[PDB]
Structures are given as structure tokens and as C-alpha cells.
């Protein structure tokens, strides 16, 4: 798994509760041989959501 963690905002650090609140989005990349396809066999589709 190729991992990237991007931080958008540091909301607060609550000293009383000792809690850090952050807004992030995780970048996760990996290989799945079962979901392997060629664009040429499907009309040039390079991406599927």
C-alpha cells in the first residue's frame, strides 16, 4: 500500500481533553490484479469510479 497523508486544517488542540483535531485526506494506492483492464478493449476508458 502506497500511503500519503495530506493535512488541510489543524482545527484545535484541546489541552483539557488532550485531543488534537485535524482535517486530512489519505492517499491510498495499491494493485489489484483482479481489476486489471486495457483501455483498448473498452473504448479507451482509462479510469473507472
Amino acid at each position, epitope marked *: 500500500i502506497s500511503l500519503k497523508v495530506t493535512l488541510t486544517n489543524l482545527i484545535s488542540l484541546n489541552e483539557k481533553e488532550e485531543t488534537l483535531t485535524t482535517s486530512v485526506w489519505i492517499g491510498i494506492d495499491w494493485q489489484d490484479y483482479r481489476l486489471n483492464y486495457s483501455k*483498448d478493449d473498452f*473504448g*479507451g476508458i*482509462e479510469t473507472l469510479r
Partner: antibody
Amino acid sequence: QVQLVQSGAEMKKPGSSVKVSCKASGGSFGSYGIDWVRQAPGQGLEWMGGIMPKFDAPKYAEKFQGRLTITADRATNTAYMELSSLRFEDTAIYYCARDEQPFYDSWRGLYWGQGTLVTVSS
Amino acid sequence: DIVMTQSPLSLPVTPGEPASISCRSNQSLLHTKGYKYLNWYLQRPGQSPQVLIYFASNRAPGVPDRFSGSGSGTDFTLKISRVEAEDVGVYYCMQGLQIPFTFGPGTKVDIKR
């Protein structure tokens, strides 16, 4: 069934401006998927301009740049062209060709209007 | 501009028999994603033009299954499996890759006698 209804025929003189409408019914059309194609008398079809999602702005042929304005209004399901500084050679039947769902970097024109004859004559 | 040419300039046809029209570009119309941006249009006499084939092989919705299209990067063909009397008019090929988009000179079809 989807119908495109264009404005009526227009009699114009040289130097004036003409505005042709193209209103749709029976379907839903958007900001893109509009292309205008004129056919001069006894001549073939000629692309004038259109709006594609790729440019997000109208693109015109070199013959019409500076004279042609193409707009599409999603809210009222209609599109317009405005050709200014009219010449005798601008006499033609002007068609609107539209697709409900636009192709990103090309155009097909599944739905055509009936065409409007604009005659520029002194 | 890309120059589109068609052959024949006139095709006398007979209802009940096959037919074929061809188009050629002076530049390759192949896209980076692997499809050819060549559309075919039919203008019947008195009517507005109608799209028949788009992107060189795909039949448009509502078009009869008789019309078929194919081609390569520079040469394209439109075929009618069985000509009908309603298929008469001027067929135009159009490149949709490079602005300004250009129509061909057109090929006229009429009943043979």
C-alpha cells in the same frame, strides 16, 4: 420526442446584424452541445462555431471571428447566434445542432433545427 | 485546417442493393485516447442534416441499423446494407478533432435508372 425550433426567416441588408434563436422542447439541454452550421445556396455545409466542455467558452471559425457570438442558456433550453457586419456572402440557411449530453472535445449534433434562411440583400 | 475529401462525388444507387461512400482526410484523425473523430451526416432534400454515424463507427440513437461506418486514421467508409428510397440526399463526412471543424464536399445519392 425532442424538437428544436429556430426563429423565423430574416430579411437583412449589408452591415446589419442578425440574431437567430434555437429553442428546445421534449428534452433537457445545457450550456454546451451547441454548434451552428450554415449552408449557402447551392453549397455544402460549413461549421461556424460552437461551445464544447473542453474550452468552456465558444470557439469560431477564422471566417467568423470578430463577427459571431454563440450563447446557450440552460435555464430556458435555448441557444442563440449573433452574426454582425453582414455581407452578401452570408446568405445561407443557418442550422443549430445540439446534444443533450455534450461530448468533451468534439460534437455530434443528434438534434437539428429546421433551419432559418437569412438573406443579406440591398 | 484539415481538408476532407469524399468519393464518389455522385453515387447512383438502386433500392434493395448495398452501397458505399468513402471519405479521406489530409491529416490523421486518430485521437490520443484511440478513437477517430469522424462523423457522417445525411441531408435529405428539403430537410435539415441528420447524423448517421459518429466517431467513425458508432451508430447514433434512432438511426436505422442499415447504416454502418468504419475507417482508419485517414481513410473512412460509410456503407448501407440495403439501400432504401428514403436514403437519397447528400452525405457529408466531418472531422471533429481540430478546430475549425470541417465538412467534406459531400456525396450525392439518387435512384439509378
